Amino acid sequence: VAAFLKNVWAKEPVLVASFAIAGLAVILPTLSPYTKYSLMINRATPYNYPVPLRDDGNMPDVPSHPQDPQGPSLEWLKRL
Amino acid sequence: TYKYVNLREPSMDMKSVTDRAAQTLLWTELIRGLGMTLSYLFREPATINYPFEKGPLSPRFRGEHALRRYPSGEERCIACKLCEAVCPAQAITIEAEPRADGSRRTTRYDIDMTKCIYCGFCQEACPVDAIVEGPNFEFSTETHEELLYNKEKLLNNGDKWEAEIAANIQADYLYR
Amino acid sequence: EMVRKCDPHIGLLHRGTEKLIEYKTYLQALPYFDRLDYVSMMCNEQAYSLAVEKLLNIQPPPRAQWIRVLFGEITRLLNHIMAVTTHALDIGAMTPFFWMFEEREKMFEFYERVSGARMHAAYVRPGGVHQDLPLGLMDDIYEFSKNFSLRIDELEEMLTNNRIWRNRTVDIGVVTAEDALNYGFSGVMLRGSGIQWDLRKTQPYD
Amino acid sequence: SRGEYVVAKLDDLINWARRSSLWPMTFGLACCAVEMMHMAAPRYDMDRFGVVFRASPRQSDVMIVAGTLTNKMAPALRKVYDQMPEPRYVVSMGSCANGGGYYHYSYSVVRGCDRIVPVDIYVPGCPPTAEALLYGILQLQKKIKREKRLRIWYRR
Amino acid sequence: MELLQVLKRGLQQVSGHGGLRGYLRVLFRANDVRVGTLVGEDKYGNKYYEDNKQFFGRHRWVIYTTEMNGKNTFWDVDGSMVPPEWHRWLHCMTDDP
Amino acid sequence: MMTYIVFILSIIFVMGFVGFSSKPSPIYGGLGLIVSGGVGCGIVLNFGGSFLGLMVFLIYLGGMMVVFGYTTAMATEQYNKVVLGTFITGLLMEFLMVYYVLKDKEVEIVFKFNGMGDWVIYDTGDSGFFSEEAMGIAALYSYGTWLVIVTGWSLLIGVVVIMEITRGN
Amino acid sequence: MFMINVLTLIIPILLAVAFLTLVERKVLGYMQFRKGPNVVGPYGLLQPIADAIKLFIKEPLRPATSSISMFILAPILALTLALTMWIPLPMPYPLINMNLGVLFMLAMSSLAVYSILWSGWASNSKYALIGALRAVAQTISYEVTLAIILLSVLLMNGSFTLSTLIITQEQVWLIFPAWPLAMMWFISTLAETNRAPFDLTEGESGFNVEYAAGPFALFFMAEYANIIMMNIFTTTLFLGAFHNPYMPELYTINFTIKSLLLSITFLWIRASYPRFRYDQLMHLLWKNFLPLTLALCMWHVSLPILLSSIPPQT
Amino acid sequence: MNLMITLLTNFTLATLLVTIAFWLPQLNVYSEKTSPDPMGSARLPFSMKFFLVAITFLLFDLEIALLLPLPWASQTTNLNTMLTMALLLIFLLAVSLAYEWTQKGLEWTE
Amino acid sequence: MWFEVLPGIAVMGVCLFIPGMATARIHRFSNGGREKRVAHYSYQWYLMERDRRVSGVNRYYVSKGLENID
Ligand SMILES: CCCCCCCCCCCCCCCCCC(=O)OC[C@H](COP(=O)([O-])OCC[N+](C)(C)C)OC(=O)CCCCCCCCCCCCCCCCC
Ligand SMILES: CCCCCCCCCCCCCCCCCC(=O)OC[C@H](COP(=O)(O)OCCN)OC(=O)CCCCCCCCCCCCCCCCC
Ligand SMILES: CCCCCCCCCCCCCCCCCC(=O)OC[C@H](COP(=O)(O)OCCN)OC(=O)CCCCCCCCCCCCCCCCC
Ligand SMILES: CCCCCCCCCCCCCCCCCC(=O)OC[C@H](COP(=O)(O)OCCN)OC(=O)CCCCCCCCCCCCCCCCC
Ligand SMILES: CCCCCCCCCCCCCCCCCC(=O)OC[C@H](COP(=O)(O)OCCN)OC(=O)CCCCCCCCCCCCCCCCC
Ligand SMILES: CCCCCCCCCCC1=C(C)C(=O)C(OC)=C(OC)C1=O
Ligand code: SF4
Ligand code: SF4
Ligand code: SF4
């Protein structure tokens, strides 16, 4: 188990490097703490129009202007 | 008394193994060959500028054949036929007869420059230093028949190249 | 991709040297041996001279013997340069051909200075050598041999450790020792299989 | 007149183009091929004259016969000569190709390569030095320079 | 720096051929431009130069004449254009011109 | 006549199909199919499908018709009335169809076709800051999970199958 | 006005090809301890003109071709595909700005093997056909790794647009995060254009043995244009330069210098090593380059996700 | 518009160069040549190795066509699914290569 | 010596500098002293056509600013 790795790394180093890179690529995104940042960067990109909602009377969370305090914030993106 | 080329076992420790694997993955000896060919680019080339510069030669050089003369105008060949006897390619044809004053002189002396192997046996078998192999080598012709020398052509070559043939003989005759 | 049969057809350079030798004297037959192997001139001359001296029951003077061995070794350098560089040129590497052909031209200059001809010297003759060495030749030989170590080192740097070069040679044409002996091989072909044989060590000359 | 001047200048142009880009093929038969290789060495440098090293037989201009032409080799030499595109030139190197040389009276040697192919330049020697073959190549260039093809075409 | 020495040597090569006209003349005739000590000249007009700092082979050279025996040799130079008394010196068979 | 560029390209497409479908020789059929594929990629590009046309050039022509001509070079050793006859009659039906289309601006063979230029069917709006076909293709890894799975399995099985049947044992 | 742009693109390509022939001869000469051509002109500056005129007044071979159609068509395709792979190259502004210029280049490079196939089939020699088939197989087998490497490199770019490739390298060179891809890409482009140590057709019949000297020169000119184009593409991919939008000459001079250095590196490679065997280069590709290319492709897909560094789509 | 103008210009320049390269020595009247491959009239031997490497290239090219939209597809919101599908596709590429490797598929053209 | 390869490399460098400089100068000249506008997506093309329609000269690089509004 231990001498096998040394022998196969002395004999075929290209395959050892390929399998190691593959294992890193397949186990690292599940372990890194920055994948959620990629998720909420991709979902916060404004491709299409933010269509407004008709004010019935009960939406305290929805802002009435872009500069209003309520609403989603991208300060985490500006700092990171 | 003998040595063992290519009988070096490879070491199997981790240092040697990682060195060989890094040499495999990063192509070290290929960079070595590239770099040394680059170093050979920045050297002065060994090319001489022909025809303005000529390669070095020696007084023993064997080029075009010539017939010499004594320092009184009399030609040196006395028709002894040793040069045509020693010629390994049979390139020399000699015919002789006594001339008007009874001297033993050739009436025909042909050398086939397409048969001759330029071996210099004739100039060393001559007892009177009559036939020589001069220093000229740039005598390429456009026709086969221009390479079939008679007596007149060889005498003209001797009269043309005497001022160099005599100096080469003076430089070399103590080694013979 | 795999070769099943090789039939080498030769005879395109059969000049008929032996009959012409039979029609001439020994001194006239010496340049035929000069022109046999046109990269190993003085070695063939030395073999002919040794055979004729053996039949004539004479031996050359010691200085002629030392001159013969020195020019045989220069001839060996010429032959090995030509063989290795042309082998690499046929495989595909072309730089060492020029790199060692410069030194080949220098050795040709040595030949011309001692004999008057660059290739076919006709220098080694039965009984010794035709002419003595001119003054100042051995200093040039010493300088050339002083730099030839670095020349061999640079050829070895270009060729030996290359993976592309060794991939074309590591397991090609493996010969066993008994098959090398039975097929009449000699020299480097015998020595590459491990057979410890050398005519300069086992049956020495001058 | 104007036409003779035009064809003279065009003849000079095409002769300069042909003589300054001579691509040789070499028949590596014998000793003289080793001397050809020594002319292709760094010292003499055949390439610097526009004369490349070992061009293909299907695109070469000058064919060099360096060595002995035996009876078993002569039809192959003629077959190679016939496939060359025009303008083609032949240079004979050394005594074996000039007239037979050492092996002139042999039973299996063609007495000169001019019995098989037309030959333009004869280089004498055994072997002729690299200087001598370079001189022969430059003399061939001089021969190409004084060609008069377009003037002959205009006058006919 | 040491590039200025190389540039200055090139400028003396331009000046040592008697100006740009001679420089271009020797450049297009001999395919070379370096200057050396004039060893001598012969009856036909060939000029023989030497430069002992160059390596063995380039340390002696000849600039051919432009007319030899009634033939225009401005571009048609020949290796057989050297008389024998200078032919012995040029091919390094001797040290004395 | 410049408004009829896609129509002219379609005419060249069907003419090349008539030419290679007459079967003169397998290599000439391959050459005609290559030309027809290039013209069809031109049709797709002029319709707005840059990615699909470049897929046609990269995979159909540069990657697959190479294999077809490569196999054609390993058979059909190198060196008619029927070929010329079908080529002539196919050209005749094609040009008769073109004349009947352009003379009356309507035609019916199996379905009803209209002889106006094909610029009329286009959409008058813009797609914003993206191309629609690229987003549709890019949704393969997010939406088409099942399609990816079945296509990749079929490709691997095809590799296994080709290795199986060419062995001979 | 646009035809002036087309002409000033395509005529300097031919001029650069001829002087590439001269430069390669001279550089190989100076690397082999000798000189290149210096007799025909001042330092050989007139050698390509003389060689071109000689090749264009040479006698044709006049073969017994099986098909004169593809015999004509193969140099047509070779020259057209050599000249058409320059129009989306940013210098720093491409002549034809393409949204998918990289994949357009891949399509043209994949289409380039039909010249080899048709030149092999048109000649009556069967050994010429076998050599053409082997060359085609090597070419497509290296197309595979070209495509995978380009796909994996483009994941740091975000699109197929060639002009964005300058914007990506505004901070650092792309050879820093993708140097194994750079080495494999360089070797794959070296084997793509059939150059040493992969030029098997010169080692022991070419695919164009029966072609005349003129069409042979056209094929060789197309090959050299392919070499220059590939080196410029490699420089754009991995060695991007600083582009001032007010002074485009800075980018033009910078990438010209870098691409000339890369082409001189091509000539440097061609005179250092022996040639490969056919099976040796097939082993080098299918068993060495391909698994590492696949591993690095998976690594460069999964890397920008875990680094929160997805490049912008537009 | 400009693209097909450039394409036509490149095509007509190539065909002009080819026409001049063909028909210019045709105006010469050099000679008439009779001329009466190492193999004389042997049939081309069918090799399974070249066909096998061609088909392997075709199948890998198809999976490359599948892999091509990854730069566009990385911009999706469903990043876990896209990453899993991409890794699965390249893993299937690797598995097909390994199956070709183990069953002596890459043999004598390795 | 080795610096004699430099004339050929210089001619090649000039012939490689020519197309990019010509392209940049032609784009700047033909677009009114500005860069050639990139239209990769239909929104940028719609802005192109709107600017061409608002120019009043049928020419997309003749851009009018605050001098047009009342
Ligand atoms: C564009 C920029 C410049 C590019 C370079 C240009 C200059 C250099 C030119 C070199 C010479 C070129 C001519 C020869 C070309 C042919 C030879 C050749 O290239 O062969 C390739 C050789 C061939 O290998 P091989 O054939 O020697 O392999 C032996 C295989 N057996 C035993 C089966 C025979 O090597 C490769 O293919 C390797 C490619 C590059 C690998 C890069 C790996 C990067 C590091 C990964 C991580 C490693 C650590 C371990 C894991 C850690 C994980 C956290
Ligand atoms: C799980 C990770 C992700 C996996 C999917 C992605 C993979 C990416 C790389 C794809 C590679 C495809 C091709 C693989 C072929 C392997 C089989 C093989 O070639 O076996 C033969 C070889 C011995 O060679 P031979 O039989 O002589 O063949 C002629 C060449 N010399 O045999 C060998 O050389 C031995 C090969 C097997 C052992 C390799 C061990 C490598 C270990 C590296 C460290 C651990 C990495 C983490 C993953 C776990 C690996 C077990
Ligand atoms: C992008 C840039 C690309 C550049 C490409 C070209 C690079 C190299 C440029 C040229 C370099 C120098 C060339 C010099 C050639 C020789 C000139 C000369 O002096 O020729 C003399 C010769 C004989 O003259 P004669 O009258 O007989 O002499 C007796 C007087 N004592 O007379 C003759 O031979 C006749 C006249 C010949 C004149 C030749 C002039 C040079 C031709 C160059 C062609 C290409 C020019 C550039 C094209 C692209 C740019 C526009
Ligand atoms: C209506 C009137 C016009 C009719 C048509 C003619 C058009 C012009 C053709 C070119 C000029 C005609 C004269 C050609 C040369 C004649 C003089 C000559 O032979 O000069 C020799 C001289 C070099 O001397 P050389 O013998 O080589 O000496 C070696 C050194 N010891 O050589 C030199 O110094 C260099 C000679 C250079 C020749 C000119 C440059 C090449 C040709 C350029 C134009 C054609 C090609 C254009 C580009 C095509 C694509 C590559
Ligand atoms: C033996 C026969 C002769 C062989 C030699 C000649 C033919 C082969 C060599 C030339 C090959 C030419 C290939 C042309 C298509 C390449 C793809 C293409 O056009 O891409 C560019 C562009 C798509 O990119 P994109 O940026 O999205 O478009 C602008 C978006 N704002 O797309 C556009 O800009 C689209 C522009 C309008 C549509 C153009 C259509 C061109 C004509 C049809 C194909 C012509 C070639 C036919 C023959 C193929 C080979 C046999
Ligand atoms: C428009 C036409 C331009 C001229 C044609 C391309 C340039 C000439 C290439 C000639 C050439 C040279 C110089 C050359 O050196 C060479 O050897 C490698 C060739 O291949 C055998 C050549 O074809
Ligand atoms: S040099 Fe030799 S072959 Fe020539 S003529 Fe003299 S003896 Fe005869
Ligand atoms: S050996 Fe001398 S003297 Fe005797 S015939 Fe010959 S040239 Fe004359
Ligand atoms: S002429 Fe002399 S050197 Fe040349 S091949 Fe004949 S024997 Fe050898």
The DSSP annotation for B10-60 comes to PP-SHHHHHHHHHHHHHTHHHHHHHHHHHHHHTS------TTTS-----TT
Search chain B and give the residue with CA nearest G26.
B41
- Which residue of C lies nearest to H108 if distances are taken between CA atoms? C1
Residues in chain A within 8 Å Cβ distance of G307: 32, 34
Distance CA C127, CA C107 (A): 24
Distance from CA of A6 to the nearest CA of G (A): 19
- In chain D, the largest separation of any two C-alpha atoms, in whole Å, equals 59
CA G20 to ligand 4 center in whole angstroms = 21
| Phi–psi pair at F48, nearest 5 degrees | 115, -5
Q: What CA–CA distance (Å, rounded) separates C7 from C5?
A: 7
Determine whether the shortest distance from the Cβ of E74 to ligand 3 is under 6 A: yes
> What gap in Å lies between CA E88 and CA B63, rounded to an integer?
13
What span, in angstroms and rounded, lies between the C-alpha atoms of I39 and I47? 9
| Residue G157 per-residue DSSP state | T
Query: What is the 8-class DSSP label of residue G44?
Result: G
- Domain containing D77: what range? 2-155
**DSSP helix/strand/coil, B141:** strand
Chain centroid to CA B114: 16
G11 lines ligand 3 (CB under 6 A): no
Residue whose entry in the numeric block shows the structure tokens 């680019």: B41
CB contact under 8 A, D82 and H31: no
Give the list of residues 6+ apart from residue F124 with CB closer than 8 angstroms, or none.
none
Q: How far is D33 from chain C (nearest CA, A)?
A: 10
Q: Which residues of F touch H44 (CB under 8 A)?
A: 74, 77
For β-strands D62-66 and E71-72, DSSP reports them as: unpaired
Residues 6+ apart with CB under 8 A from B1: C201
Q: Is B72 annotated as a binding residue?
A: no
Residue I18 identity: I
Of G33, G269, G273, the CB nearest to B40: G33
- The secondary structure of chain D as a DSSP string is -HHHHHHHHHHHHHHHHHHTS--EEEEE-SHHHHHHHHHSSTTT-GGGGT--SS--TTT-SEEEEES--BTTTHHHHHHHHHTSPSS-EEEEEHHHHHT-GGGTT-TTB-S-GGGTS--SEEE-SSSPPHHHHHHHHHHHHHHHHT--HHHHHHH-
- CB–CB of A42 and H87 under 8 A? no
Indicate which CATH number applies to the domain containing H65: 1.20.58.1610
Ligand 2 touching residue A17 (CB < 6 A): no
- Tokens in use for A58? 């009960």
Residues of A in contact with H83 (CB under 8 A): 29
Can you give the resolution of this entry in Å?
3.2
Give the rounded distance of the alpha carbon of F67 from its chain centre.
17
| Burial (CB count within 10 angstroms: exposed 0-12, middle 13-18, buried 19+), residue B103 | exposed
Q: Is the CB of A12 under 6 A from ligand 2?
A: yes
Chain C interface, best mutation among B5, B58, B83, B172, by max C CB count within 10 A: B58
Task: State the SS3 of chain F.
Answer: CHHHHHHHHHHHHHHHHHHHHCCCCHHHHHHHHHHHHHHHHHHHHHHCCHHHHHHHHHHHHHHHHHHHHHHHHCCCCCCCHHHHHHHHHHHHHHHHHHHHHHHHCEEECCCEEECCCCCCCCCCCCCCCCCHHHHHHHCCCCCCHHHHHHHHHHHHHHHHHHHHHCCCC
What's the fold here for domain B64-173? Alpha-Beta Plaits (3.30.70)
Whether H7 lines ligand 5, by a CB cut-off of 6 Å, is yes
DSSP string, C117-141: -SS----EETTEESSPPPTTHHHHH
Q: Angle at CA D136, nearest 5°, toward C90 and D95? A: 75
In angstroms, the separation between the Cα of residue F130 and the nearest Cα of chain A is: 8
Q: How far apart are CA B39 and CA G31, in angstroms?
A: 9
CA distance to C34, F45, F56, per residue, from D99 (Å): 19, 71, 66
For residues H29 and G182, give the distance between their C-alpha atoms in angstroms, rounded to a whole number: 53
Q: What is the distance of C-alpha G163 from the center of its chain?
A: 19
First-to-last C-alpha distance (Å) of chain B: 40
Q: What is the spatial distance between Cα G99 and Cα G159, in angstroms, rounded to a whole number?
A: 8
> CA B87, CA B128: separation in Å to the nearest integer?
17
Q: What is the dihedral of CA G22, G26, G32, G38, to 10 degrees?
A: 120
- Is the separation of the CB atoms in G110 and F62 below 8 Å? yes
Asked whether the bond before B45 is cis by omega within 30 degrees of 0, the reply is no
User: Residue for token digits 């301890």?
Assistant: G33
Q: How far is CA B136 from CA D138, E79, F166, in A?
A: 17, 10, 71
How many domains is chain G partitioned into structurally? Answer: 1
**D:130-149 residues touching chain E, CB 8 A cutoff:** 131, 135, 138, 142, 145
Span from the CA of F42 to the centroid of ligand 5 (angstroms): 6
Nearest to H21 by CA among D57, G57, G46: G57
Chain center to CA of F5: 17
**Which ligand is nearest to the Cα of residue A6, counting in written order?**
2
Return the DSSP state at G289. I
Determine which helix (DSSP H) or strand (DSSP E) holds B105, and give its type and residue range. strand B104-112
G128 touches chain H (CB under 8 A): yes
- The C-alpha atoms of residue D103 and residue G116 are separated, in whole angstroms, by 47
Measured CA to CA, the distance from residue I32 to residue I62 in angstroms comes to: 7
G259 closest CA partner among G186, G192, G154: G186
- The answer to whether I7 and G45 are in contact (CB under 8 A) is yes
Residue E3: other Cβ atoms inside 10 A: 7
Q: Which ligand sits closest to the CA of D8?
A: 4
Residue pair C92/G203 in contact by the 8 Å Cβ criterion: yes
What whole-number distance in Å separates Cα of residue C189 and Cα of residue C177? 9
Distance CA(D58)–CA(D51), nearest Å, equals: 16
DSSP-derived 3-state class of residue G143: helix
- Which spans in chain A are helix H? 2-11, 13-27, 35-42, 75-79
- Ligand 4, atom 10: closest residue by C-alpha: D13
Q: With left for phi above 0 and alpha for psi between -120 and 50, is residue I23 left, alpha or beta?
A: alpha
Residue type present at position H108: W
Helix (H) or strand (E) holding C200: helix C199-202
Q: Which long-range contacts (CB under 8 A, 24 or more apart) does B141-147 make?
A: B141/D121, B141/D122, B141/D124, B142/D120, B142/D121, B142/D122, B142/D139, B142/D143, B143/D122, B144/B114, B144/D98, B144/D99, B144/D112, B144/D114, B144/D119, B144/D122, B146/D122, B147/B112, B147/B113, B147/B114, B147/D98, B147/D99, B147/D122, B147/D124
Sequence-distant (6+) residues with CB within 8 A of H98 are none
Range of the domain at I23: 1-70
Amino acid letter for position B117: I
Q: Which amino acid is at F108?
A: E
Say how many domains are in chain H: 1
Residue indicated by tokens 């595109």:
D85
* Beta strands F106-108; F112-114: pairing state: antiparallel
CA G58 to centroid of ligand 6, rounded, Å = 13
Largest CA distance in chain B: 99
Give the Cα-Cα-Cα angle D107, D109, D113 (nearest 5 degrees): 150
Alpha helices by DSSP H, listed for chain H, are: 2-23, 48-67, 70-73, 79-102
| Owner of token pair 């897929």 | F55
CA distance G43 to G37: 7
Of E91, D85, F52, A32, the closest CA to residue H83 belongs to A32
Cβ-in-10-Å burial (0-12, 13-18, 19+) of D134 comes to buried
Domain count, chain I: 1
With a CB cutoff of 8 Å and minimum separation 6, the contacts of B97 are B105, B107
Instruction: Let me know if domain F4-166 sits in CATH 3.40.50.720.
Output: no
The DSSP 8-state label assigned to residue G59 in this structure reads P
Token representation of residue G24: 């390669």
Q: Are B2 and C196 in contact (CB under 8 A)?
A: yes
Cβ atoms of F74 and H51 within 8 Å: the answer is yes
Stretch 21-80 of chain H: residues touching chain A, C-beta under 8 Å? 75-77, 79
Report how far residue G231's alpha carbon sits from residue G224's, in angstroms, rounded to the nearest whole number: 11
B80 annotated to bind ligand = yes
Please provide residue G244's backbone torsions phi and psi, each rounded to the nearest 5 degrees: -85, 120
DSSP strand pairing (D89-93 vs D62-66)? parallel
Hey, what amino acid is at G162? L
What SS3 string covers F2-32? HHHHHHHHHHHHHHHHHHHHCCCCHHHHHHH
3-state secondary structure of B148: strand
Method: cryo-EM
Q: Which residue of F has its CA nearest to I43?
A: F128
Amino acid in position F13? F
At residue E67, φ and ψ (nearest 5 deg) are -160, 115
Please report whether residue H108 resides in a domain.
no
Q: Which of H89, H91, H83, H96 is nearest to H67 (CA)?
A: H89
The answer to whether E55 contacts chain G (CB < 8 Å) is: no
Residues facing D121 on adjacent strands: D91
The crossing angle, in degrees rounded to 10, of helices C95-115 and B28-41 is 50
| Alpha-carbon span E87 to A71, nearest angstrom | 100
Neighbours of G218 (CB within 10 A): 26
Atom of ligand 2 nearest to the CA of H90: 6
Alpha carbon separation from E1 to E5, F1, F51 (Å, rounded): 8, 70, 57
CA atoms lying within 13 Å on the CB side of residue F140: 20
Nearest of B69, B126, B77 to residue B106 by alpha carbon? B77
Query: Which residues are bridge partners to F106 per DSSP?
Result: F114
Interface test with F, best of H85, H88, H93 (most F CBs within 10 A): H85
**Structure-block tokens of residue C115:** 């004999």
| C-alpha H3 to ligand 3 mean position (Å) | 38
Amino acid (one-letter) located at D11: D
* B67 touches ligand 8 (CB under 6 Å): no
Q: Say if B and F touch: at least 3 Cβ pairs within 8 Å.
A: no
Amino acid at position E49, single letter: Y
Residue reference for tokens 């840059």: F50
Q: CA angle E43-E49-E51, nearest 5°? A: 165
The SS3 assignment for G276 reads coil
Instruction: Choose among E52, C99, E56: nearest CA to B54.
Output: E56
Closest atom, ligand 9, to C-alpha of D94: 1
Q: Which helix (H) or strand (E) holds B67?
A: strand B65-67
